[PDB]
């Protein structure tokens, strides 16, 4: 562990994708993942979508879930037998991937290719990927509240948070989710399913006018909010939290509008703050507009340092400077970063997508610049927004596409995004999608 060829600093989806890509391009490559979490790398979407709907009492311990085809799968990317011990990593034949769990990189020295752990040990690298993700943000009211409130508040990011929230969902009669983004809405749907199973109460509130107000247009966000409300969830749009305090032995959220929220637990899903603590020491530039580490089209920050995943603010040549916090983007960025550290020079070409399933009636895919600020053109089959496709336009050019309740139609959207054609009317373009 003194010296490693490939060093991935944040153990997660992007790090695992980069390690797999490095092993694919370079047989015998020695890759070390330094994860501050004690858990081996695992995929996060099941924690909020699939592990909740599993029909298994031991889902807490097994951490297994069923896929589309019905095959059971663990949330871990690979079993522990795949990973090699970090002690024997320099000596293992034909290389391997090793994870150093429970170790945080606190000091990053760009000029000596060195990283110092929280325990004081130092690791020298040749190629380094900053695959750190982010940490869930906290409310100002929660932070300035007492210790009892912070005891009854959870930041849903990792497996431990999933187990805790599930235990509370079993043992507590009321849960409030702060935020209406991706994680907030997914947790709202899962907890609403659990509450309908049990009879308990689930609350979700957010400043925006609807769920994913930063991603979907206002009508689509309103439709999605109606769907999650019919998922058995109390949804409170246009809610700004002033203070939170323990009243009558239970949490009491005081909103800026004056309405009170009596609850027994709080899940704060109020965005992600990228882990840029290493930038201060390493002298790495931080993007002021998007946050995270600033990198070029090849996910490169310095001569031997790449940044991929949640903390990477990169330049996509087709669409501009972006930071994308998504699982499939984490996989694609890890793949591209591993290719680049192996010795390639590929820019960000293959656009990454993402998916969301807010109940049986809401399931969508999206690619490219999906921002609620951009103007959009939506073509829907047959007030009802059941099936269709939404095009995001920058200057008459489709920069982003939302495939709304249509499946196996991603190649067409990717082809449309790849070309920069200025389409006169988009109904003809939508005709490529047999939405009916």
């Amino acid at each position: 562990p003194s010296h490693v060829p490939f060093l991935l600093i944040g153990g997660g989806t992007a790090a695992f994708a980069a390690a797999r890509s490095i092993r694919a391009r370079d047989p015998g490559a020695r890759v070390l993942i330094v994860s501050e979490d004690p858990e081996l790398p695992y995929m996060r979407p099941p924690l909020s979508k699939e592990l909740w709907f599993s029909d298994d009492p031991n889902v807490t311990k097994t951490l297994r879930f069923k896929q589309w085809n019905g095959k059971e799968r663990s949330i871990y990317f690979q079993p522990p037998s795949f990973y090699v011990s970090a002690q024997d990593l320099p000596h293992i034949e034909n290389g391997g991937v090793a994870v150093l769990t429970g170790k945080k990189v606190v000091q990053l020295d760009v000029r000596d290719n060195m990283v110092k752990l929280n325990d004081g040990s130092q690791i020298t690298y040749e190629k380094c990927l900053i695959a750190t993700g982010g940490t869930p943000r906290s409310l100002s009211a929660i932070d300035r509240a007492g210790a009892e409130v912070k005891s009854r508040t959870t930041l849903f990011r990792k497996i431990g948070d999933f187990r805790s929230l599930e235990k509370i969902s079993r043992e507590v009669k009321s849960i409030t989710i702060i935020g209406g983004g991706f994680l907030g809405s997914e947790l709202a749907c899962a907890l609403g399913r659990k509450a309908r199973a049990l009879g308990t109460e689930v609350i979700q509130l957010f400043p925006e006018k609807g769920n994913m107000g930063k991603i979907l247009p206002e009508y689509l966000s309103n439709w999605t909010m109606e769907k999650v409300r019919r998922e058995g969830v109390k949804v409170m749009p246009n809610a700004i939290v002033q203070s939170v305090g323990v009243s009558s032995g239970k949490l009491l959220i005081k909103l800026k509008d004056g309405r009170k929220v009596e609850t027994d637990h709080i899940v704060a899903a109020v965005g992600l703050e990228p882990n840029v603590e290493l930038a201060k020491t390493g002298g790495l530039e931080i993007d002021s507009d998007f946050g995270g580490f600033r990198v070029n089209a090849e996910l490169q920050a310095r001569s031997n340092i790449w940044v991929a995943g949640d903390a990477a603010c990169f330049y996509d040549i087709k669409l501009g400077r972006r930071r994308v916090e998504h699982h499939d983007h984490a996989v694609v960025s890890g793949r591209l970063a591993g290719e680049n550290m192996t010795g390639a020079a590929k820019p960000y070409w293959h656009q990454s997508m993402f998916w969301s399933d807010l109940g049986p009636d809401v399931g969508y895919e999206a690619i490219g610049l999906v921002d609620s600020s951009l103007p959009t053109v939506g073509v829907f089959a047959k007030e009802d927004y059941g099936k269709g496709v939404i095009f995001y336009l920058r200057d008459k050019v489709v920069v982003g596409i939302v495939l709304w309740n249509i499946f196996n139609r991603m190649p067409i959207a990717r082809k449309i995004i790849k070309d920069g054609e200025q389409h006169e009317d988009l109904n003809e373009v939508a005709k490529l999608f047999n939405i009916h």
């Binding site: 009508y219 103007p375 959009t376 089959a381 988009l426 939405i435 009916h436």
Partner: peptide
């Protein structure tokens, strides 16, 4: 197949045969 414009977002409704028609 009727349209509707709200601010910067336009929505087009399309019928199955209208989609079918070249």
């Amino acid at each position: 197949s009727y349209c509707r414009q709200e601010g910067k977002d336009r929505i087009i409704f399309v019928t199955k045969e209208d989609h079918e028609t070249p």
